[PDB]
From Swiss-Prot, chain A:
One GO term of the biological process aspect: cytoplasmic translational initiation
Entry function: Acts as a component of the translation initiation factor 2B (eIF2B) complex, which catalyzes the exchange of GDP for GTP on eukaryotic initiation factor 2 (eIF2) gamma subunit. Its guanine nucleotide exchange factor activity is repressed when bound to eIF2 complex phosphorylated on the alpha subunit, thereby limiting the amount of methionyl-initiator methionine tRNA available to the ribosome and consequently global translation is repressed.
Disease: Leukoencephalopathy with vanishing white matter 2: An autosomal recessive brain disease characterized by neurological features including progressive cerebellar ataxia, spasticity, and cognitive deficits. Brain imaging shows abnormal white matter that vanishes over time and is replaced by cerebrospinal fluid. Disease severity ranges from fatal infantile forms to adult forms without neurological deterioration. The disease is progressive with, in most individuals, additional episodes of rapid deterioration following febrile infections or minor head trauma.
Gene it is expressed from: EIF2B2
Protein's UniProt name: Translation initiation factor eIF2B subunit beta
From Swiss-Prot, chain C:
Name this polypeptide is given: Translation initiation factor eIF2B subunit alpha
Organism of this sequence: Homo sapiens (Human)
Role according to the record: Acts as a component of the translation initiation factor 2B (eIF2B) complex, which catalyzes the exchange of GDP for GTP on eukaryotic initiation factor 2 (eIF2) gamma subunit. Its guanine nucleotide exchange factor activity is repressed when bound to eIF2 complex phosphorylated on the alpha subunit, thereby limiting the amount of methionyl-initiator methionine tRNA available to the ribosome and consequently global translation is repressed.
Gene: EIF2B1
Activity control, per UniProt: Activated by the chemical integrated stress response (ISR) inhibitor ISRIB which stimulates guanine nucleotide exchange factor activity for both phosphorylated and unphosphorylated eIF2.
GO biological process terms on file: cytoplasmic translational initiation; oligodendrocyte development; response to glucose; response to heat; response to peptide hormone; T cell receptor signaling pathway; translational initiation
GO cellular component: cytoplasm; cytosol; eukaryotic translation initiation factor 2B complex; membrane; plasma membrane
Recorded superkingdom: Eukaryota
Source organism phylogeny: Eukaryota, Metazoa, Chordata, Craniata, Vertebrata
GO terms, molecular function: guanyl-nucleotide exchange factor activity; identical protein binding; translation initiation factor activity
Similarity annotation: Belongs to the eIF-2B alpha/beta/delta subunits family.
Subcellular location: Cytoplasm, Cytosol
Length: 318, 266, 260
């Protein structure tokens, strides 16, 4: 009844006015739960109206915050599941809901298992007496390093982001487990080159041409890695695959208040100074080497193949 | 033969002209029809030496995979799909142009012109640079066609390709054929401009339809067939110099067109 | 003006010289019949003939300078022979030469190579704005050389069939680049992309006090559809001048010593 609508506006408002869950896995889980509840307690006598309603809700969620491509992936996966069930049955109208609920539950179980599946492949790409560099705070790279360091010993260098110094928390968490981490600013990135053996970083999402969207300063790291010919492996689960190619996207990066960059107490010079604080950036696909996910490492040229199964081509525009 | 008298419409291309000529001459029979179709295709390409014409003829003859009722119905629908492919490509490609951007083009191309007209219909402002196309003057005719679209245009010599490269934002050109690896076959003044764009790190976009997919795997400029080059009129572009390809099957990377070519059974 | 008649007559009389050479002849022939008027004559000559070579020659003459005026042209007369002798060694039998425009210095180099009992093929660019590749091919065909003419748009198609690239230069800049025909930068880029040697042949009176960073740094009075362009020194392999073989990084010291 009204409870579903109330949860819908609450989710939309908490997505729009600010950030939601700290981890993307929880966000995906609650998006799947919201979609399942929408499917359950709604009146729909055929698949077409259900898909239309799901598409409308996905469009509303995307318009709430387009900077994050997490809810839209869940909407597209649900639409693909609906289409697959309809093709299996009609190719009906009686046991569709139970099949949909089962598909949602298995998808949730797989999403829960992605973390362990990714963490299980830590020892293959990491050796002893190696130098690994990470930028920012990521829950996947941290698990990778902590699983790889329980059997070997290496060196990790963590660089924090200038506006949001989230790398300090990552360095503290790693050093609490005995990894011998280092803390340094973004300026000394080219200087620290020529001594790093491997680069392992995360990303917010993966584009269609193999590109990815990550925190600011990742483009400089990729350029330095390409200049020094060091491998660059990105660990990201399967729900970060965005089926949209990189367009012009003048609003690709998220712009926040200039308070983080420049304090409000600067004086009268703030009336004629332009301050911009982008959050994300664009990394060309040619600067990436490997893509580690829950089904195994894959080349950047397998992104379209991986995406084709996940999302139906007609749902790319949603 | 008969392709010459369907050239009354300048909007349509030579490959589609051969396709519709084959469709019209199909309903003249009085299996052995495959040999007749092959001979008709050979006579069609004997007048105009284009890879696009041969690929389109092969794709047209591929629908085989009295009992002629089924066969005839496919030609008109196929022609309608080629007709809608241009609009689909324009719709998919017009989103990559921003306000105030500079666009560099090589020679005349109806697909590029349609994409530009769609972008102008999307309320966007941009400038176009066209190479004069010294062998046959087609860049100036493309500029003349774009003149009445209220779009600022300027024709430059083929020699001055690397001089204005830094002033361009993106490069979009057509293609007379897509090879298996991922490269394209276009006018002679294409490979060097692509090399200059790659050296300047400018994006390189290619727009082509699905009937221009040819099954060739060249390794250099001399690996292309001699019948297609005829002062050569066609060259080869490496797939590593192409950023994205916009076709009627969706946006495809240079490494992703090989799978489409294999699945097309051409 | 008061010297354009002499300028045009000198251009009409002998075809072997260049615009800078003709300007030098006009200058030292009007010298007998001073800094201000000489500078005005150089300025009006540069205005009438828009080329960096004329300005470079006039400035070098003004710095060098009646008994001292003969040395400059007496030296530059045999400077071409010295450059040809220095450059003809780098050509091997069976090699392929890729030229862009028509220049007498590279013609002398090729004729010295053919006089040294060598066999090679020459590819020339038709020079679309003013047809000079055809003129070069017609002037070189009667040297018993298999020379063919290609289009301006075919530079990237015949790159794989060329062993080395030899082109002229109308002016050398401080960083080691050259100011050549408009279609030279793309040829240099294509040669660099295929690891093809790029040899530049020029004299010593073509040095200018210019340090361009891109195509927009070239003065508008020299480009005038531009006529010339800028080539980065990183795309040049070697330079052959009358002052010996010079690396692109060594041009700055020679320019400083020459006092522009």
């Amino acid at each position: 009844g009204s409870e579903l609508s109330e949860r819908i506006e609450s989710f939309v408002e908490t997505l729009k006015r600010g950030g939601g869950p700290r981890s993307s896995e929880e966000m995906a889980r609650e998006t799947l739960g919201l979609l399942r509840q929408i499917i359950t307690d709604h009146r729909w006598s055929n698949a077409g109206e259900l898909m239309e309603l799901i598409r409308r809700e996905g469009r509303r969620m995307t318009a709430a915050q387009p900077s994050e491509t997490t809810v839209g992936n869940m909407v597209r996966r649900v639409l693909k599941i609906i289409r697959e069930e309809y093709g299996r049955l009609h190719g009906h109208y009686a046991q569709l809901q139970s099949n949909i609920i089962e598909a949602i539950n298995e998808l949730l179980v797989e999403l829960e298992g992605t973390m362990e599946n990714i963490a299980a492949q830590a020892l293959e790409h990491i050796h002893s007496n190696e130098v690994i560099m990470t930028i920012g705070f990521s829950r996947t790279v941290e698990a990778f390093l902590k699983e790889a360091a329980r059997k070997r010993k290496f060196h990790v260098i963590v660089a924090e982001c200038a506006p949001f110094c989230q790398g300090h928390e990552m360095a503290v968490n790693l050093s609490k487990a005995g990894i011998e981490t280092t803390v340094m600013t973004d300026a000394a990135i080219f200087a620290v080159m020529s001594r790093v053996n491997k680069v392992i970083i995360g990303t917010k999402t993966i584009l269609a041409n193999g590109a990815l969207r990550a925190v600011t300063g990742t483009h400089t790291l990729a350029l330095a890695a390409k200049h020094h010919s060091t491998p660059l492996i990105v660990c990201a689960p399967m729900f970060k695959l965005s089926p949209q190619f990189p367009n012009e996207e003048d609003s690709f990066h998220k712009f926040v208040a200039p308070e983080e960059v420049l304090p409000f107490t600067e004086g009268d010079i703030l009336e004629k100074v332009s301050v911009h604080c982008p959050v994300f950036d664009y990394v060309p696909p040619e600067l990436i080497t490997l893509f580690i996910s829950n089904i195994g490492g894959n080349a950047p040229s397998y992104i379209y193949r991986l995406m084709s199964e996940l999302y139906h081509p007609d749902d790319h525009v949603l | 033969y008969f392709k010459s008298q369907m050239k009354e419409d300048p909007d349509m291309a030579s490959a589609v002209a051969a396709i519709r000529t084959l469709l019209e001459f199909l309903k003249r029979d009085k299996q052995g029809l495959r040999a007749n179709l092959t001979s008709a295709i050979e006579t069609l390409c004997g007048v105009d030496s284009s890879v696009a014409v041969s690929s389109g003829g092969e794709l047209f003859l591929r629908f085989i995979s009295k009992c002629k009722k089924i066969m005839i119905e496919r030609g008109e629908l196929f022609l309608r799909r080629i007709s809608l492919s241009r609009n689909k490509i324009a719709d998919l490609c017009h989103t990559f142009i921003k306000d105030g951007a500079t666009i560099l083009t090589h020679a005349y191309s109806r697909v590029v012109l349609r994409v530009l007209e769609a972008a102008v219909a999307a309320k966007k402002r941009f400038s176009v640079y066209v190479t004069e196309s010294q062998p046959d003057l087609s860049g100036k005719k493309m500029a003349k066609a774009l003149c009445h679209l209220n779009v600022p245009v300027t024709v430059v010599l083929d020699a001055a390709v690397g001089y204005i490269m830094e002033k361009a934002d993106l490069v979009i050109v057509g293609a007379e054929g897509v090879v298996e690896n991922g490269g394209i076959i276009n006018k002679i003044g294409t490979n060097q401009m692509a090399v200059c764009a790659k050296a300047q790190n400018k994006p390189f976009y290619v727009v082509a339809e699905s009937f221009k997919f040819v099954r060739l795997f060249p390794l250099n400029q001399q690996d292309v067939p001699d019948k297609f080059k005829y002062h050569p009129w066609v060259d080869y572009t490496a797939p590593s110099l192409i950023t994205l390809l916009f076709t009627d099957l969706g946006v495809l990377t240079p490494s992703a067109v090989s799978d489409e070519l294999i699945k097309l059974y051409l």
